[PDB]
Amino acid sequence: VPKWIQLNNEIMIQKDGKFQFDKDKEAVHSYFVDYINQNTVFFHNLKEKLDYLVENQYYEEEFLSLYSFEDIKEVFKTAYAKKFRFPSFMSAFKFYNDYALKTNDKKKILERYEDRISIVALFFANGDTEKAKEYVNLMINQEYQPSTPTFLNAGRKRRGELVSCFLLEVNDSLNDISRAIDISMQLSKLGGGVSLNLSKLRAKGEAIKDVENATKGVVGVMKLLDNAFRYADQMGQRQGSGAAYLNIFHRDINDFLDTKKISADEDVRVKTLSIGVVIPDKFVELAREDKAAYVFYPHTIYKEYGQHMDEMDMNEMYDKFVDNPRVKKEKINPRKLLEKLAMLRSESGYPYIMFQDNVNKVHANNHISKVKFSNLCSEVLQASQVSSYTDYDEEDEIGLDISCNLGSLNILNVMEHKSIEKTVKLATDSLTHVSETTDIRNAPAVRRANKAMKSIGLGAMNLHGYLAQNGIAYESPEARDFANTFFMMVNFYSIQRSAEIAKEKGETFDQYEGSTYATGEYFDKYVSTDFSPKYEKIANLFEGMHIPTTEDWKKLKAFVAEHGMYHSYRLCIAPTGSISYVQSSTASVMPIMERIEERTYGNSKTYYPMPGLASNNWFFYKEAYDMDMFKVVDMIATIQQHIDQGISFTLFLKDTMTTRDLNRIDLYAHHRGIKTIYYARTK
Amino acid sequence: VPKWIQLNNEIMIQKDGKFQFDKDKEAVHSYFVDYINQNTVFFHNLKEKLDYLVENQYYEEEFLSLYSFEDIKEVFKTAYAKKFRFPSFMSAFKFYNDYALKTNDKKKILERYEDRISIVALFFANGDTEKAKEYVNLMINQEYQPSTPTFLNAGRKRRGELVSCFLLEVNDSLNDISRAIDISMQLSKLGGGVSLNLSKLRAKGEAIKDVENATKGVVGVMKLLDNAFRYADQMGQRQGSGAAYLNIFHRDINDFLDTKKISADEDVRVKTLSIGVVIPDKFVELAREDKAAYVFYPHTIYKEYGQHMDEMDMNEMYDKFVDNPRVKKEKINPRKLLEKLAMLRSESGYPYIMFQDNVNKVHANNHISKVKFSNLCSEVLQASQVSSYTDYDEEDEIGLDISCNLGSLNILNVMEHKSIEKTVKLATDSLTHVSETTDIRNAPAVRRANKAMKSIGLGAMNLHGYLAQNGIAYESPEARDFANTFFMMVNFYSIQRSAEIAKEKGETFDQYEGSTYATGEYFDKYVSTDFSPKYEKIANLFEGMHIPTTEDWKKLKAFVAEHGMYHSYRLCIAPTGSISYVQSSTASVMPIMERIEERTYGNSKTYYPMPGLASNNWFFYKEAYDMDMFKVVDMIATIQQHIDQGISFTLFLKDTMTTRDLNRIDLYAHHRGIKTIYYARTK
Amino acid sequence: DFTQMFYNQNVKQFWLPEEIALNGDLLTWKYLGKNEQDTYMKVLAGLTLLDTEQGNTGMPIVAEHVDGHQRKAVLNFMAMMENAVHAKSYSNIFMTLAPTETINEVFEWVKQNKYLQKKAQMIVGLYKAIQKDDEISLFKAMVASVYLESFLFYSGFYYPLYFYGQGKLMQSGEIINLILRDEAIHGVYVGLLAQEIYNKQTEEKKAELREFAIDLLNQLYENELEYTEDLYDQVGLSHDVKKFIRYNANKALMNLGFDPYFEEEDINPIVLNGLKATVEPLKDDDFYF
Amino acid sequence: DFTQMFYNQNVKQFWLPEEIALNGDLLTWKYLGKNEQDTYMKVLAGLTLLDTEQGNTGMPIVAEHVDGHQRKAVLNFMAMMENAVHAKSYSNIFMTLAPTETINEVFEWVKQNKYLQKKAQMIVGLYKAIQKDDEISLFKAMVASVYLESFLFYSGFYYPLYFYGQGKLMQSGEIINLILRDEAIHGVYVGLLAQEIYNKQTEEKKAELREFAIDLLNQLYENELEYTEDLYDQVGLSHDVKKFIRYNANKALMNLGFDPYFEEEDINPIVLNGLKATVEPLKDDDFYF
Ligand SMILES: Nc1ncnc2c1ncn2[C@@H]1O[C@H](COP(=O)(O)OP(=O)(O)OP(=O)(O)O)[C@@H](O)[C@H]1O
Ligand SMILES: Nc1ncnc2c1ncn2[C@@H]1O[C@H](COP(=O)(O)OP(=O)(O)OP(=O)(O)O)[C@@H](O)[C@H]1O
Ligand SMILES: Cc1cn([C@H]2C[C@H](O)[C@@H](COP(=O)(O)OP(=O)(O)OP(=O)(O)O)O2)c(=O)[nH]c1=O
Ligand SMILES: [Mg+2]
Ligand SMILES: [Mg+2]
Ligand SMILES: [Mn+2]
Ligand SMILES: [Mn+2]
Ligand SMILES: [Mn+2]
Ligand SMILES: [Mn+2]
């Protein structure tokens, strides 16, 4: 057992009835005195290091060639002047095991934290030394964290794509299904998580070229996609991850759900394909009134109306579908379906729940399309247009496939530096740069939507960490007040930066003129409701920072009207799995699952306390499972009212609560305006 | 139970110790006087029938519009003038259950045998009334039988494709793999059996752009193809059938074979994809000498030499592969691999065995490409060039994917009518028409190969029926002499018709100038060796027909040199599974499995005696399992010497014999020049 | 050719009653009508009573007369499942849903019931008639056993599967599904042992054994129709239950290597939702001819 | 007062030989002398024979004659363990360590070995002499069964335990310890049933039953001595094994409620070292907040 691992395991050993949290710090020192410095490759000067990394195909020549060597050296010096120290052993371990650049033999460390941050900053700035230094100060203060793809791969020649969330629309044809399989394989090859909408696909027992009972339904397509994702597994590094979304009014919805049951046969169950269910308000109304619902055959609806079932508003179309004899449908019990969803989420955490009307009643780009499905993490909610992939030697009709750009603000570090505006604007600029530098040659609709929509996702993390280190309970009304104010400022500065980029470049996102930004509707609740903190403690937390008022929001609305907005979507709160370790932050805006988490690496045990955990804030670091899920829903809705896309919202349940409690949480989330529900993790 | 069912079951009720074969005839009468005539749909005249079939989307109106109604009436009258009667109940039952056109609800019979034959003939003639009458006389005499796709689907609006088998070359890339999956689904949707050569795909543990041990090998692609064929299953009517072919020198050859082991795990086992193994002469030489062999990693060979492992001759490059340190290889025991092949064929009948050198030592189009794999029935052996399917928005390099149209001569009916020449020429014309009117819009390499190669497959059926009905034992040297003479005549007249078509159209198949037809090498054994019957009985059997001599072959060689050949490939002997029932013929050139076969249909059981089975020819209808497989190999080699493509050669084994006997049969087949071995069916 | 394979499948299906918590069924049980509760109780008691005969007599008597150590072991395992697992599982379901006095009364009723008794005693009669070293009498008992395992249980299984397919009584329905899965393999296995005896017989003796099997099936089937109406008319399900009986009768016949007796019918979708050749090395000179 | 706790203990002890990987014994087996391997194979073959008959005959026949569904369930479970688990485990050991010819030879050797045939003849004879409703014949068979469980197995168990205790053949030894753990509880249980019958008798009848038990033990003992010498003389252990079987004979007597018959002796210390979520429906009030 290594010395740093012993020093880390000494945390659980209680002295005077208290955990030895400070010992973790010592572990970090050991982890750097015994391992990191010994296995870190050192060079006589930075010029030699850069030459070795470029020549050995570690870095890219293009992004480094935009700067003189003096500017690169100045950026590296700015990164190293902070003298950044990892506060916990797990932060440094996760960085140097997951993100630090290693030799081809994987035994030496080529990149420190400062080196990786400097390289990512130089990639972000695209030739501006001052902008690169600003990015270096942003990331070394740990105010902003690029996502795992961006942080890991920026500036590296041997790399995947910087985007890892992809949403694909699948049209109801064999050509479109095969193209969707191909694109899923290509994007999993790039290292991205792929979500596919299967609602347009006709159900099982439908007609193919006017022969009856011929379609295999969406379950056969799910089997094909599951095989494709198993095959494309990042060159045998990570398990291929894919998601399939189906509307709850699709007839296959039960069989869809049956793919996640343990009792399902081998020809029914898909193991590497996550599933999500899109639930329109009509289904919730039918379940609430206990009226029996109807699941429709999509192809009959398409034949009758010329549009797909998921392309029209089910609230106004459901009665017409039911009363139409030419539309084929099957009787179901919506309450039984809700109970089945709750039971499946209890067993396996699936499916993801998308409340379609909750997403689309605040969607700014409904003119382009309504949000029909979400991503693999159930937080990307954007307009998508299906593509018509025709036969060979025939021109395809390329639509819009969602691929947003991830990046997370560290709420604790951002707010302690009183730099919400600067961090949000710099993160928006970096996300815009990464979106502009993304070029996928095997996903035509993804590339077209990236060029047109210019959608980015700016998330936040360390919400619970910040609240606990400031003596605020996550379920307290003060925490929701802080979340409201902080995320309203984040939205304000994100919109301001998007409008500034649109003014500078002279271009907005495609079909912006029809958006609620152009019409000013988006700013309605912002020009009438003041989002300043209602509690003195939160106001003192925001001291030293200008909180945008209704007049500031009116000025921003006028600015957007005059200049437009560059990004169709700006904010989405991703789970932030492993980057939260490196940043010493709690994951996403979720409450912490455990105060101290026990992990097993190799044959060794390691202990990670939550950041800033001590005896004084032990009670404020309440575990997520012990919390009331209604108050967690309230906080997530408070944040969601300022996020244009969704939030990865995992439910944290105890083994005691039943499926009725899960359904109640889901229905309260639907009532409170929650757009997506990610997971049902049972303790 | 139906009256005809009782009459057919009365065959096995012996009277005076003999089977009541004549009862079978009675059954057909019943089957027509109680079911077919009552279930048939009669019109006032042919005009009303044709109009009803045209407007109700049963028939394509284009092929019928090329004839005036008087000509169509004359063709139908020619078909009905023969007064064709089905001699066995099973012939009529199989036609009216599998090939006769029925209504949309399948409650009535719209097409008689004469109606189907007339429609197929009118489609074949393409506006020529005299040619349509010739086709009608050829098919109503049952001298020639179009394949099941062509016979069933010719002239139908709801038809599929007329091509039975498709062969795809899969290049070593994710884009090519995805395109192969798409094309396999498209062609299975069209109803054709798809064969894919996986020998170019790099083995398991190869590098995908400098990251090693990343590839899943051919087994992952096999699983993808298996799921694709499961999904595309002819709209749920016929199970999707696919074939995978791998060279025996591929490193994955064991894992490949492990897909068919009955103890294979679900993550490896493949159940809807047939497997074939391509064995060069080098492997047989290594096994014979007991020298340990080496299987190779295709990607290392491609990197070192710039060509795929199956793209070059292993007999001359195996030592270079072994001595090359930059080529990666694994040690295997070739005798152990042969024993594994024999055990697998005993257990499940797989893999198909393709003796590559036996195919390519007489292959006429080696300049275009060597034959690297076979079809799903292991009888199509043609040159194929792999396609380079590139990224989206990039032009693809379209290669040649094999596809040929099947058609079988009924040997008994052809020789009874003394019309080898006329039947062969008319069948060649019909297959040329089927190739010309075939246009597949989702398989580009298949379309290009169909347009360029113009390859057709003219098979033969009722070899054993003709031999047994003429008092010739199938294993006798007289039977092999008859096969030699008959198939030399078939080859002569097929080459003559191909050259005549090339002369009349002024065009040959692509790259004909480099073929052995153009250089005259193909005719060598035909201009030096006489293939006239060596037995007086066979010569009497061939009386009334001009058997080509060496002078006729020299004249044909000169004619080909002057005019060329329209078809790259002309003769391939398919299994002819279910259409042999309608023709009252034994399946293909294979010996009969059983004298009387008991088949269960619905809740009833039926007995089909072999065509012409009686007391005097009971022992001439020797069952295949009771026959010496070495003499069957001799027969198949004798036929194969006159067939440019392969023959679907099924091995018929007894349970008592061991895997060593199967290996001996395989090695004798390789020694005798057998190109492919189809199945190892054990009694 | 088959005993080791069935050994494997049997032992890997091993389970215990304690694995399924039953108490949560009370949350749907309380919402059923009196007729539904009555039918369920009666069906459950029917299954319990028949399965006890199979555990105490049916499986042990067949194990006694069958030759072969490996067959005796598989048969012992099946007898164990009847007595140690299935019987305890049925008791557990009862004790969860009804008070002691109600259980005693239902069993008193079903014990006196004419249609349950007719089939129970017909089966037991054939087990009692097996004679030492007489394979014909053993075969007849095996036919009876297959009819119980693969056919007679299913008029009963229908109802728990019907609830299970609707989301009602899910815990007891899971238990019933595990039991049913065991009886299915028991029926297939005993069926193969019966076919072995059948195949050793002359053609005349075979025809005679076929007539026996069909005659027995007919007697049991006509009583099943009466049993079915007696239990299921009060909940309106008899028509669909009858289709399920015939479908399972056909499976039982196929287990005995016989043709289906009844035409194919579709089954209630709610119930559906509930539901080596000898290796010889190459010796060289096999490559030369 | 005891069946339920034996039921629970038996079912919680359930195991399969496949749970234990045996390839780890390959080297310590290879290293034994030919004499040692021979004795080991033969010892396990003798055990296989005993379990074959205990599973096929002994346990099922006692189950048939003992009253009460729970008592029958325990006895049926024990029967299954004998032939479906114990007897089969020995073949798992044989198939790992020995080539087919050596396996074939040892099974031929059990058929012709006079001591093994004599002990089987005696034990199985008593099982087959049980008369329905005759408690005395049943008692005699239960004594025979206790002597098989708690005495006769031990001339065989000695050797795997002797190796296990030296750190040799430890995977095979793990299987044997599981078998031994089962037989110990089987011997106690059958012993308690035998005592039930004995306690119903007059003092005169009891005196005769003790005579039967002691005469039978002595007869089996004398045969086991010859068997032990035949197997163990070639490995030098016969005297040690004899002490072990006497020790276990006393345990068998105690299981029958009788006083120990042999004097205590020091046993080889090596051998001593060898020893779903709950579901509620949705109410209309759960849709409003
Ligand atoms: N907690 C930590 N986080 C990150 N790096 C660390 C940490 N502890 C030590 N290191 C690394 O090890 C070096 C030694 O640091 P130490 O605590 O011994 O003193 P120092 O004054 O920071 O040293 P130096 O002269 O290297 O700057 C640091 O410069 C840094 O590179
Ligand atoms: N074996 C058969 N094959 C094909 N069609 C048959 C067969 N048997 C009967 N039919 C059909 O059923 C009709 C019944 O007539 P059948 O053969 O009994 O003799 P028919 O009334 O004297 O006239 P004909 O033989 O001249 O048609 C036939 O005309 C024919 O259309
Ligand atoms: C992407 C991917 C490829 N492969 C294998 C199958 C293909 O035959 C083979 C080639 O993939 P390619 O698509 O050719 O990958 P590449 O072009 O980026 O890499 P290279 O330059 O080396 O050609 O890699 C996998 O096994 N799994 C995968 O996920
Ligand atoms: Mg379409
Ligand atoms: Mg490539
Ligand atoms: Mn049972
Ligand atoms: Mn049973
Ligand atoms: Mn035992
Ligand atoms: Mn025991």
A158 shares a domain with A74:
no
Strand partners, A216: A204
Helix residue ranges, H only, B84-166:
89-94, 113-125, 129-140, 148-153
CA–CA distance, B663 with B660 (Å, rounded to integer): 5
**What CATH number is associated with residue D189?**
1.10.620.20
Partners of residue A660 in chain D, C-beta under 8 Å: 279-283, 286
Q: What is the largest CA-CA distance in chain B?
A: 80
B314 shares a domain with B259:
no
| Ligand 5: centre distance to CA B643 (Å) | 38
Active-site position among A111, A360, A377, A462: A377
**What CATH number is associated with residue A254?**
3.20.70.20
Nearest in space to A385 (alpha carbons), one of A195, A196, A570, A169? A169
Domain endpoint, select from A110, A142, A174:
A142
Nearest in space to B512 (alpha carbons), one of B454, B557, B472? B454
CA–CA distance, A144 with A430 (Å, rounded to integer): 10
Identify the helix (H) or strand (E) that includes residue A376: none
A328 shares a domain with A340:
no
CA–CA distance, B337 with B257 (Å, rounded to integer): 10
CA–CA distance, B100 with B39 (Å, rounded to integer): 12
Compute the residue count for chain D.
289
B89 shares a domain with B60:
yes
Domain presence at residue D53 = yes
Resolution for this experimental structure (Å): 3.9
CA–CA distance, A499 with A294 (Å, rounded to integer): 44
What would the DSSP string read from start to end of chain C? --HHHHHHHHHHT---GGGS--GGGHHHHTTS-HHHHHHHHHHHHHHHHHHHHIIIIIHHHHHHH---HHHHHHHHHHHHIIIIIIHHHHHHHHHHHS-HHHHHHHHHHHHH-HHHHHHHHHHHHHHHT--TT-HHHHHHHHHHHHHIIIIITHHHHHHHHHHHTTTSSHHHHHHHHHHHHHHHHHHHHHHHHHHHHHTTS-HHHHHHHHHHHHHHHHHHHHHHHHHHHHHHGGGT-HHHHHHHHHHHHHHHHHHTTPPP-S------HHHHHH--PPP----SSSS--
What would the DSSP string read from start to end of B317-331? HHHHHHH-TTS-EEE
Neighbours of C216 (CB within 10 A): 17
Which residue matches tokens 């089910």?
Answer: A314
A383 shares a domain with A521:
yes
Domain endpoint, select from B107, B142, B177:
B142
B299 shares a domain with B276:
no
8 Å CB contact between B422 and A371: no
Burial class, B307, CB count within 10 angstroms (exposed 0-12 / middle 13-18 / buried 19+): exposed
Structural domains counted in chain A: 3
Angle subtended at Cα B70 by Cα B69 and Cα B73, rounded to the nearest 5 degrees = 85
What would the DSSP string read from start to end of B351-381? -EEEEHHHHHTS-TTTTT-------TTS---
A258 shares a domain with A347:
yes
- The whole-angstrom distance between residue A2's C-alpha and the CA centroid of its chain comes to 36
Which residue matches tokens 């039984």?
Answer: A336
Provide residues with CB under 6 Å of ligand 3.
A 189, 231-233; B 172-175, 177, 201-202, 208-209, 215-216, 220
Partners of residue A336 in chain C, C-beta under 8 Å: 166-167
Angle subtended at Cα B173 by Cα B170 and Cα B177, rounded to the nearest 5 degrees = 50
Interface test with A, best of B104, B182, B272 (most A CBs within 10 A): B182
**Tokens representing C241?**
């239950």
Burial class, D57, CB count within 10 angstroms (exposed 0-12 / middle 13-18 / buried 19+): buried
Structural domains counted in chain C: 1
Which structural domain range is residue C1 located in? Answer: 1-275
**Tokens representing B664?**
């001996």
Strand partners, A353: A277, A677
3-state secondary structure of D180: helix
3-state secondary structure of B51: helix
| Residue C69 assigned as binding residue | no
C127 carries an active-site annotation? no
How would you classify the pairing of strands B242-247 and B193-197? parallel
B286 shares a domain with B234:
no
Identify the helix (H) or strand (E) that includes residue A144: strand A144-146
Compute the residue count for chain B.
683
Chain C's closest residue to D278, CA to CA, is C24
Interface of D with C (CB under 8 A): 7, 11, 14, 16, 52, 55-56, 60, 63-64, 69, 72-74, 76-77, 79-80, 82-84, 87-88, 276, 278-281
Active-site position among A153, A375, A405, A410: A375
CA–CA distance, A646 with A358 (Å, rounded to integer): 10
Residue nearest to atom 25 of ligand 1 (CA): A83
CA–CA distance, A594 with A637 (Å, rounded to integer): 23
| Ligand 5: centre distance to CA A335 (Å) | 51
Angle subtended at Cα B452 by Cα B449 and Cα B453, rounded to the nearest 5 degrees = 75
Domain presence at residue D26 = yes
**Tokens representing B82?**
């023969």
Please indicate whether, in this complex, the C-beta atoms of B603 and C282 are within 8 angstroms of each other: no
Peptide bond connecting A351 to the previous residue in cis, omega within 30 degrees of 0:
yes
A427 CB-near residues (< 8 Å, 6+ apart): A138, A144, A407, A409, A458
B162 shares a domain with B49:
no
Which residue matches tokens 């040659």?
Answer: A441
Sign of the Cα torsion A47, A48, A51, A52 reads negative
Q: Is the CB of A123 under 6 A from ligand 1?
A: no
CA–CA distance, A301 with A307 (Å, rounded to integer): 7
CA–CA distance, B606 with B10 (Å, rounded to integer): 10
CA–CA distance, A249 with A327 (Å, rounded to integer): 13
A188 shares a domain with A80:
no
Partners of residue C167 in chain A, C-beta under 8 Å: 336, 339-340
8 Å CB contact between C150 and C185: no
CA–CA distance, B125 with B132 (Å, rounded to integer): 5
**Tokens representing B621?**
């209808």
CA–CA distance, A64 with A46 (Å, rounded to integer): 13
Please indicate whether, in this complex, the C-beta atoms of C84 and D73 are within 8 angstroms of each other: yes
Neighbours of A285 (CB within 10 A): 16
Which residue matches tokens 């399309």?
Answer: A369
8 Å CB contact between C62 and C53: no
At residue B17, φ and ψ (nearest 5 deg) are 75, 10
Which residue matches tokens 């916990």?
Answer: A88
8 Å CB contact between C63 and D73: no
Domain endpoint, select from A102, A119, A142:
A142
CA–CA distance, A120 with A113 (Å, rounded to integer): 11
Which structural domain range is residue A295 located in? Answer: 281-333
8 Å CB contact between B337 and B287: yes
Helix residue ranges, H only, A324-419:
334-348, 356-360, 411-416
CA–CA distance, C284 with D86 (Å, rounded to integer): 45
CA–CA distance, B368 with A442 (Å, rounded to integer): 31
CA–CA distance, B25 with B29 (Å, rounded to integer): 7
Angle subtended at Cα C108 by Cα C106 and Cα C109, rounded to the nearest 5 degrees = 65
3-state SS string for A64-131: HHCCCHHHHHHHHHHHHHCCCCCCCHHHHHHHHHHHCCECCCCCCECCCHHHHHHHHHHHHHCCCHHH
Which residue matches tokens 């429609």?
Answer: B119
Is A683 in the D-facing interface, judged by CB distances under 8 Å? Answer: no
Residue nearest to atom 5 of ligand 2 (CA): B85
CA–CA distance, B146 with B133 (Å, rounded to integer): 16
Is A651 in the D-facing interface, judged by CB distances under 8 Å? Answer: no
8 Å CB contact between A494 and A552: no
Q: Is the CB of A28 under 6 A from ligand 1?
A: yes
8 Å CB contact between B75 and B133: yes
3-state SS string for A313-328: CHHHHHHHHHHCCCCC
Q: Label residues A180-209 b or e (16+ Cβ within 10 Å = b).
A: bbbbbbbbbbbbbbbbbbbbbbbbbbbbbe
Q: Is the CB of A239 under 6 A from ligand 1?
A: no
Experimental technique, in short, is: cryo-EM
A296 shares a domain with A236:
no
Tell me which amino acid residue C173 is: G
B122 CB-near residues (< 8 Å, 6+ apart): B63, B64, B67, B72, B75, B132, B155
B504 shares a domain with B366:
yes
User: C-alpha distances in angstroms, D3 versus A44, D71, D89, D134, D146?
Assistant: 81, 6, 27, 22, 17
Chain A's closest residue to D282, CA to CA, is A660
- Ligand 2 atom nearest B28 alpha carbon: 1
